mmCIF file of C-alpha atoms in Angstrom:
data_model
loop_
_atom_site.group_PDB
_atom_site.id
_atom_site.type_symbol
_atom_site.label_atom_id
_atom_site.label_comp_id
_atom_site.label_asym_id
_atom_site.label_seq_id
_atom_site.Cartn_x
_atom_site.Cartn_y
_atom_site.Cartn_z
ATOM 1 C CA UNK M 1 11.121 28.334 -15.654
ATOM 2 C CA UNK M 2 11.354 25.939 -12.287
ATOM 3 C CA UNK M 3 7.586 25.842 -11.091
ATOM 4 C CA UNK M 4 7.097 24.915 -7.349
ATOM 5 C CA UNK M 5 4.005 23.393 -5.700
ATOM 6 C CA UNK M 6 3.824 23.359 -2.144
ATOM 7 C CA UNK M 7 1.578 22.389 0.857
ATOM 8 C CA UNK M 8 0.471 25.608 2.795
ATOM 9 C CA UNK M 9 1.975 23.453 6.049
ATOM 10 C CA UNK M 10 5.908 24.400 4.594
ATOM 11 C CA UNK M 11 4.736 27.971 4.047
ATOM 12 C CA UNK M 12 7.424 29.636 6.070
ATOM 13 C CA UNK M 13 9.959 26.906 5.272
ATOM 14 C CA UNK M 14 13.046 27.679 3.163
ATOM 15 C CA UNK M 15 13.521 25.067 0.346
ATOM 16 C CA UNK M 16 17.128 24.578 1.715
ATOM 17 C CA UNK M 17 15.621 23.595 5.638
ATOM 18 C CA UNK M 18 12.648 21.797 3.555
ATOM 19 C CA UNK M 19 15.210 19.553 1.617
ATOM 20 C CA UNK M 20 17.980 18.877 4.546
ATOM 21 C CA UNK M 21 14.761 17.950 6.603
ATOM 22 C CA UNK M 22 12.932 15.603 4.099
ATOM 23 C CA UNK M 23 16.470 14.083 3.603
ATOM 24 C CA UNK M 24 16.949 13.359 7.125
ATOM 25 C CA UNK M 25 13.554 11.860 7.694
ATOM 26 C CA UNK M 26 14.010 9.389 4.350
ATOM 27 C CA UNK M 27 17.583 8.621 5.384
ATOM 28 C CA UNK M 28 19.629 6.084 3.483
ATOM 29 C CA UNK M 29 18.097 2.972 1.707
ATOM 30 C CA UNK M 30 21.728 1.776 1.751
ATOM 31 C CA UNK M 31 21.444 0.830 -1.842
ATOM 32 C CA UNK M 32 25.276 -0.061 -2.604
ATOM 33 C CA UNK M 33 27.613 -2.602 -3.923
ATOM 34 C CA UNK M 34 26.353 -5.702 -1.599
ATOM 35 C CA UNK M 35 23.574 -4.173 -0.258
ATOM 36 C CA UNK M 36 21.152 -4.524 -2.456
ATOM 37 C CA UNK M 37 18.040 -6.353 -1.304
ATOM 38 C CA UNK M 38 15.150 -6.809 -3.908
ATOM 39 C CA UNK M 39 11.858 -5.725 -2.751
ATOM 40 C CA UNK M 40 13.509 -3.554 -0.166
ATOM 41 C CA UNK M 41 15.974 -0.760 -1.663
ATOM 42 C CA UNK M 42 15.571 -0.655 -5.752
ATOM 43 C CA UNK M 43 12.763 1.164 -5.492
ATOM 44 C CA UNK M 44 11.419 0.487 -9.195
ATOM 45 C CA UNK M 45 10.732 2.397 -12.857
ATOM 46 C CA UNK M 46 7.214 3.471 -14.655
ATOM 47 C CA UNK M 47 7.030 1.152 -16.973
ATOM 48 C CA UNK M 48 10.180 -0.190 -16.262
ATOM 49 C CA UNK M 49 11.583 -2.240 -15.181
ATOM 50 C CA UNK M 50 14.520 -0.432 -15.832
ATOM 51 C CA UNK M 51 13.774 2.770 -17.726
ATOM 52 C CA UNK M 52 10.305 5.202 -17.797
ATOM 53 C CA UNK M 53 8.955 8.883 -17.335
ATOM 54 C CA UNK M 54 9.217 7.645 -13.559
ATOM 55 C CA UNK M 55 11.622 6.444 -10.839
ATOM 56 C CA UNK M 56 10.055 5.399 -7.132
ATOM 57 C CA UNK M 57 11.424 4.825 -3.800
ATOM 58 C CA UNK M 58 10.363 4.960 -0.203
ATOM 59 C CA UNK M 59 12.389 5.121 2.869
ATOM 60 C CA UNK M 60 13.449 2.191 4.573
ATOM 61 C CA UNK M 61 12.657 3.983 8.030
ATOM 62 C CA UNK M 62 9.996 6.170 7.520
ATOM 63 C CA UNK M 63 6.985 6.561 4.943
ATOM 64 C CA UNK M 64 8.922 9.453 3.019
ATOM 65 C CA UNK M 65 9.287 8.778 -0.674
ATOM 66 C CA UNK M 66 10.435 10.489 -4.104
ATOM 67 C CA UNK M 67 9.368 10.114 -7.413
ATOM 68 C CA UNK M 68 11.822 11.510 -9.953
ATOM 69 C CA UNK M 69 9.853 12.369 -13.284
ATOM 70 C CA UNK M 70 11.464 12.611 -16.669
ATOM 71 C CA UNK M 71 12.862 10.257 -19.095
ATOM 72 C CA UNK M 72 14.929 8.221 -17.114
ATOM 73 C CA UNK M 73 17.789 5.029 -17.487
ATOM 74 C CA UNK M 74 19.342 2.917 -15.585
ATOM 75 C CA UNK M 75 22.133 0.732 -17.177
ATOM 76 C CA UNK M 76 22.161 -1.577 -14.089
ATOM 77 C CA UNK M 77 24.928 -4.428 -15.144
ATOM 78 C CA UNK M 78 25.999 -2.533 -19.127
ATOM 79 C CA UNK M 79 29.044 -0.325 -18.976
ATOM 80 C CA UNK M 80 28.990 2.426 -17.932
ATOM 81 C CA UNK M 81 27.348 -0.200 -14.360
ATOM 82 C CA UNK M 82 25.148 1.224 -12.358
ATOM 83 C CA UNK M 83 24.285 4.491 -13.964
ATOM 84 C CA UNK M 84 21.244 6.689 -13.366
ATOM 85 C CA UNK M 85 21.157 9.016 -16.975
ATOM 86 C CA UNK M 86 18.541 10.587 -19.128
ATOM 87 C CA UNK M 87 16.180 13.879 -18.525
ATOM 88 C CA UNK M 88 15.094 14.842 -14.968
ATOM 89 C CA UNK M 89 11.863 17.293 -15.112
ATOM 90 C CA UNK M 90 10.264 17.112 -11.565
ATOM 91 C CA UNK M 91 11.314 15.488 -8.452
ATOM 92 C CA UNK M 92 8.207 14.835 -6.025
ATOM 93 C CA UNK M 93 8.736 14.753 -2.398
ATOM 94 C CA UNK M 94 6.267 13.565 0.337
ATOM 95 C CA UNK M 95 4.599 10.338 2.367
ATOM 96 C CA UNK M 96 2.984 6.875 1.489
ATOM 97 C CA UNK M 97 4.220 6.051 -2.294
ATOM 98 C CA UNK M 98 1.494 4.235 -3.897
ATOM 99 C CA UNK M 99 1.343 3.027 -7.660
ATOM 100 C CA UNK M 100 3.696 0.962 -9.740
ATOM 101 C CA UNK M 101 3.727 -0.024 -13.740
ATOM 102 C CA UNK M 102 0.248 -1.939 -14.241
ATOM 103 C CA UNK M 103 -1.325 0.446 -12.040
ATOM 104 C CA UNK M 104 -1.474 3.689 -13.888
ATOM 105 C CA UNK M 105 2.530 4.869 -12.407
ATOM 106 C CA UNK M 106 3.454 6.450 -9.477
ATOM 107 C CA UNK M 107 1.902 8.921 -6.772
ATOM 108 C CA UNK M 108 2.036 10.155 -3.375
ATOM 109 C CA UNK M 109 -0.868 9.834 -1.284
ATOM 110 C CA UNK M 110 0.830 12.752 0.867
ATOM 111 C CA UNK M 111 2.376 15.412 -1.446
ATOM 112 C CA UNK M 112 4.240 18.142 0.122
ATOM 113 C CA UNK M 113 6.888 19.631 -2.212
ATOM 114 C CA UNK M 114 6.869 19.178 -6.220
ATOM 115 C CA UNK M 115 9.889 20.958 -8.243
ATOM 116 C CA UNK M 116 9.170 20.771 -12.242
ATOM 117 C CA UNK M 117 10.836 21.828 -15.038
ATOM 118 C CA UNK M 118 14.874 21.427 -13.660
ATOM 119 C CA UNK M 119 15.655 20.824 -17.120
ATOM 120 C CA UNK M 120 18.421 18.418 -15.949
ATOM 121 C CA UNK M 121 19.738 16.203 -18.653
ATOM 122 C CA UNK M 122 22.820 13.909 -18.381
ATOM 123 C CA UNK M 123 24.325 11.556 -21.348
ATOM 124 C CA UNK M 124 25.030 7.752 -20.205
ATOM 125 C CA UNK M 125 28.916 8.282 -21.385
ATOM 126 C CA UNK M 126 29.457 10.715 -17.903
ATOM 127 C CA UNK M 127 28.495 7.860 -15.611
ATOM 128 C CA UNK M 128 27.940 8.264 -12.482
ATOM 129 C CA UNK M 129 29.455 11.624 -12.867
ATOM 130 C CA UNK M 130 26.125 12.885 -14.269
ATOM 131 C CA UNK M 131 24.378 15.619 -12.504
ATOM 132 C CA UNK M 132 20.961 13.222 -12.818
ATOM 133 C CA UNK M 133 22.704 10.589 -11.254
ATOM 134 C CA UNK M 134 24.373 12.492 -8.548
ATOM 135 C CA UNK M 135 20.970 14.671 -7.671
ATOM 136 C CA UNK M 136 18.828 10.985 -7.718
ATOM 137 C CA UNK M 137 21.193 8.661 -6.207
ATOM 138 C CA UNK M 138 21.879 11.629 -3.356
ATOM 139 C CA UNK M 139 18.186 11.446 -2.708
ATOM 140 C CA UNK M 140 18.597 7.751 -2.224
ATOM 141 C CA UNK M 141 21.722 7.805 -0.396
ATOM 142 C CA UNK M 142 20.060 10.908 2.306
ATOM 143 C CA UNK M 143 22.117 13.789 0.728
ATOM 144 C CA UNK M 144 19.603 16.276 -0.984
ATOM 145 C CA UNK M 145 22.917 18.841 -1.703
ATOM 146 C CA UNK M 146 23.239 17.965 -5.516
ATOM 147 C CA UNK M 147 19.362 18.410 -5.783
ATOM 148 C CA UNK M 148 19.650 21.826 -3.847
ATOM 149 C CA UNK M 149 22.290 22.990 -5.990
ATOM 150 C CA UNK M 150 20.142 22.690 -8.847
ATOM 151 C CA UNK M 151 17.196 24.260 -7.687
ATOM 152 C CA UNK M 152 19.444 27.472 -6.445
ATOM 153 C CA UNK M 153 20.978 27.948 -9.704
ATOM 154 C CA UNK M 154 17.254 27.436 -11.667
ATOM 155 C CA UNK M 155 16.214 30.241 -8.709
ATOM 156 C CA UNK M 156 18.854 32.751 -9.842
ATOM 157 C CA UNK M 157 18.443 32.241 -13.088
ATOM 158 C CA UNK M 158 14.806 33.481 -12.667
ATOM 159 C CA UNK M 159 15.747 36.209 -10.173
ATOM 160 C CA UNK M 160 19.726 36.821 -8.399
ATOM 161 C CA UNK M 161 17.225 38.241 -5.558
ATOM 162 C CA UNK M 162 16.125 34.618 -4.961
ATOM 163 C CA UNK M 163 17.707 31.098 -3.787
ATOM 164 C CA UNK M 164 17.308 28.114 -1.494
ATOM 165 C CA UNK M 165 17.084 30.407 1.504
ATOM 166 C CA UNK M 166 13.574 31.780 -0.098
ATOM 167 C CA UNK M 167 10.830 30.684 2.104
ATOM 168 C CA UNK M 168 8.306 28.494 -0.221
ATOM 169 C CA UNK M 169 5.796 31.816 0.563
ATOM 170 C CA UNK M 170 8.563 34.133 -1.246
ATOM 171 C CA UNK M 171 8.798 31.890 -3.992
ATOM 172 C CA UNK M 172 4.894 32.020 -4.575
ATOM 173 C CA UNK M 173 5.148 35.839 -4.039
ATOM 174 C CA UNK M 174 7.555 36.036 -7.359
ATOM 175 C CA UNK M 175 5.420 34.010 -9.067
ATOM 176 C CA UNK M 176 7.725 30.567 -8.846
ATOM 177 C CA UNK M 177 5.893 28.333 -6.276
ATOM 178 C CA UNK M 178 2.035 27.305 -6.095
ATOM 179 C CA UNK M 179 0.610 26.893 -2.474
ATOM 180 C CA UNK M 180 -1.677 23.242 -2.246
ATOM 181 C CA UNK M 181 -3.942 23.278 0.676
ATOM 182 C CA UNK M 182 -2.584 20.507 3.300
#
């Protein structure tokens, strides 16, 4: 089942104002045809440098950063181009990314919302069509919606009585989500 962990600040949040939030606050790296800038919007893989268990990236306007954890691809210039695919497991959300291949992968020196166990899982042949790529590159791009759709059908599938409009404090009540002490 989904599996939440949350810091006792977001309490009385519900995951969908949590998400829209975060997304707001991490904006858009702009990483798109032309816009690509190494060492500024790639963000990078664990071990990489272009597949791993882990995919980074902080905001270009704040100190908000993911780390998507699974077994994750990226077919950069091979067809199908540009392609996030593979298994998505967790998705960590929070401040001040620290980490990278050499030094033991990727955390967040500020945790404040952890989903694990989406079971998401998308083939290379779909593309950019792929759920994974479509809930990853939207947390790139500042659109958490495919992510939120995801965690509201994983929700309902544990209970029709709960969804994205749970606060993170109803969630721990029906034994989804874990309160961390902030």
């Amino acid at each position: 089942s989904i599996s939440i962990s949350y810091s006792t600040t977001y309490s009385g949040w519900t995951v969908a104002d949590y998400l829209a939030d975060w997304s707001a606050y991490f904006g858009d790296v702009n990483h798109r045809p032309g816009q690509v800038v190494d060492g500024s919007n790639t963000g990078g893989f664990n071990p990489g440098p272009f597949d791993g268990s882990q995919y980074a990236l902080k905001s270009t306007a704040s100190d908000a950063a993911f780390i998507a954890g699974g077994d994750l691809h990226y077919t950069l210039f091979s067809n199908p181009s540009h392609t996030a695919w593979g298994k998505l497991d967790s998705i960590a959300l929070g401040d001040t990314l620290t980490g990278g291949a050499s030094s033991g992968g990727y955390a967040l020196d500020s945790q404040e919302v952890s989903f694990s166990n989406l079971g998401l899982d998308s083939p290379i042949a779909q593309g950019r069509d792929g759920t994974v790529h479509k809930v990853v590159y939207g947390l790139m791009s500042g659109d958490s919606s495919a992510l939120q759709g995801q965690i509201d059908a994983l929700l309902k599938a544990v209970d029709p009585s709960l969804s994205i409009n749970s606060t993170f404090d109803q969630l721990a009540a029906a034994g989804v989500a874990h309160a961390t002490p902030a």
